């Protein structure tokens, strides 16, 4: 096989249809299902799979008590087949760590996992299921990465890391790998103030990532990387339709190269597909918590500071808990264009549901259609009372 090249553009997005759903917490009430969080999806030339960061216990096991914490030596990046739950018996460990990213280049796959204490963390880059490169913390404050898939163009796979405080300025870097080996890296450029957890997709020899400002921005920072020249830039989304969480209510005019006021120093991971009038942003329904999830067609959201919704689709109702969300595409499908896809993490347990002592999630995934399909809402489905 040769290295994949981003030769196509995006298909027209007129609506979203279900792609995959695992019902992990329903099934796990009586099965050997692992406690997880921070999931994603990623394809190979021959199959697409579910990915997530395990917590080293099953939901019903006594060690599930205290799983709200995010960093320990008992986590690892796992992958199971599309739509099954993350089972003790069917999961394949990709690497050990509490932060990650992964992606195929046409030939084979590259995975990255970060572990260690907050002041002495390090990343080990696996290529073809073997360790190839290691990177030590440069700012001694929680080295961390995307938490969703990377993208490659002719062997080159860019990946973005951050090290430094959340509530303030950090040192973000963009590394350019090829066969797990570093070709180069460069510090963040452009107008972006802070960059966390990037969600990326590629089309026509270009890669675009929508990230999280935490510190301040309620409107999202966007990075554009050229995998051939190995350069990038950054800016913010102009639209007044805010998409972070927590966030203030929608203003009438937004800001293009400055983050949005009102709320600061917290957030959630998300994504968008910026393609002119073929632009769709996703966001939670509540401005206070991670409840609900909806997609909105906001033409030219990137460059137009007065853009508003033109069409929409509700994924999870306001009463139902959601969480992180990100992007992926099956770059090896047959066709004249790339079909956009995404997933949403449905968190159950602490902190919102404190009758239980654990924290876990399920996954709902959808892809675009050129048709105008009718909608349904996709919640987790588990009855918390059954766990008492």
């Amino acid at each position, epitope marked *: 096989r040769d290295f994949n090249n981003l030769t196509k553009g995006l298909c027209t997005i007129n609506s979203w249809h279900i792609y995959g759903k695992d019902n992990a917490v329903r099934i796990g009430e009586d099965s050997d299902v692992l406690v997880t969080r921070e999931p994603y999806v990623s394809c190979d030339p021959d199959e697409c799979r579910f990915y997530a960061l395990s917590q080293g216990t099953t939901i019903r096991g006594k060690h599930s008590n205290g799983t709200i914490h995010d960093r320990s030596q008992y986590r690892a990046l796992i992958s199971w087949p599309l739509s099954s739950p993350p089972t003790v018996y069917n999961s394949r460990v990709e690497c050990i760590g509490w932060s990650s990213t992964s992606c195929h280049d046409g030939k084979t796959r590259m995975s990255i996992c970060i572990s260690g204490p907050n002041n002495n963390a390090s990343a080990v880059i696996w290529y073809n299921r073997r360790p190839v490169t290691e990177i030590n913390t440069w700012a001694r404050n929680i080295l961390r990465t995307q938490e969703s898939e990377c993208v490659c163009h002719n062997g080159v796979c860019p990946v973005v890391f951050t090290d430094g405080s959340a509530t303030g300025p950090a040192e973000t870097r963009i590394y350019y790998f090829k066969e797990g080996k570093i070709l180069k890296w460069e510090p963040l450029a452009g107008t972006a103030k802070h960059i966390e957890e990037c969600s990326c997709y590629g089309e026509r020899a270009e890669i675009t990532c929508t990230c999280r400002d935490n510190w301040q921005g309620s409107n999202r920072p966007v990075i554009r990387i050229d995998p051939v020249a190995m350069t990038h830039t950054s800016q913010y989304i102009c639209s007044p339709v805010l998409t972070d969480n*927590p966030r*203030p*209510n929608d*203003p*009438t005019v937004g800001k293009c190269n400055d983050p949005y*006021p*009102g*709320n600061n120093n917290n957030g959630v991971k998300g994504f968008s597909y910026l393609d002119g009038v073929n632009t769709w942003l996703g966001r939670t329904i*509540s*401005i*206070a*918590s991670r*409840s609900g999830y909806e997609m909105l067609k906001v033409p030219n959201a990137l460059t137009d500071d007065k853009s508003k919704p033109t069409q929409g689709q509700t994924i999870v109702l*306001n*009463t*139902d*808990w959601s969480g992180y969300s990100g992007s992926f595409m099956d770059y090896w499908a047959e066709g004249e264009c790339y079909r956009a896809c995404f997933y949403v993490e449905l968190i159950r347990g602490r902190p*919102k*549901e404190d009758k239980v002592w654990w924290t876990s999630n399920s996954i709902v995934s959808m892809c675009s259609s050129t048709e105008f399909l009718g909608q349904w809402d996709w919640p987790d489905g588990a009855k918390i009372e059954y766990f008492l």
Partner: antibody
Amino acid sequence: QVQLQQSGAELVKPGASVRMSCKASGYTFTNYNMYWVKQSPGQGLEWIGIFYPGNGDTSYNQKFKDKATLTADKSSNTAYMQLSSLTSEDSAVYYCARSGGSYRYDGGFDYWGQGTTVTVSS
Amino acid sequence: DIELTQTTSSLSASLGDRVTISCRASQDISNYLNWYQQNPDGTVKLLIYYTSNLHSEVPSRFSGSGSGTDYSLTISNLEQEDIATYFCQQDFTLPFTFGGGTKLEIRD
């Protein structure tokens, strides 16, 4: 017609805890955010927090987290607020209002209760 | 958070006239500002919401306006039942904050 009726005045000693109610009527309780407000001399009107009976979500004003606890009884359509470790600084009038924007955080507080007065001292 | 300031806490006026109370926000709140009426008996009522929308069954002599940081409420021709304290509140971002209030007294 929408009507929110609150409990009676509380005369309490320092160090006690109290629990007041707000009985809702004339609307579908599970579809609206229920807000709580405090009114006192030399301080004015302050928002305390929010409880949405639809799924049990809550949020507090950093100032009042530790003092108050939002709870509700979906069957009796009653919402409650407990204030703990009472100090004379808590003597004031307390109100419960409804979200004019249903489950959203806009539209103002469209209907209020008449208020419950808590008087703390020895 | 956003601080709301209601200039002048007292407004002695005479029945029949047209008063105007104002509120100024520490920052742009994109029209997300509302007005309430607290009677001398304890009753609180929503008058206007979103800079100028009238809540149901509110006497049409009440009107509001503004933009950015400056907003106002106007009562065309005072009646005796307009004796109350008026407050402004924002809901552009949490936590919600209210103004200091302005006591309106129909001067004897």
